[PDB]
Curated annotation (Swiss-Prot):
The record marks 14 as: Important for the flexibility at the center of the helix, flexibility that is important for the stability of the voltage-gated pore. It is found in: Secreted; Target cell membrane. It comes from Apis mellifera (Honeybee). The gene is MELT. N-formyl-melittin major has 80% of the activity of melittin. The modification Glutamine amide is found at residue 26. This is Melittin. It comes from the Eukaryota. Expressed by the venom gland. Monomer (in solution and for integration into membranes), homotetramer (in solution and potentially as a toroidal pore in membranes), and potenially homomultimer (as a toroidal pore in membranes). Belongs to the melittin family.
Length: 26
């Protein structure tokens, strides 16, 4: 999505740490 490029910018915040989080914790 062309317009999603700007959206993902914020979605990457919670998804960034979520990656390492799921690793150890839920």
């Amino acid at each position: 999505g062309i317009g999603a490029v700007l959206k993902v910018l914020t979605t990457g915040l919670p998804a960034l740490i979520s990656w390492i989080k799921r690793k150890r914790q839920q």
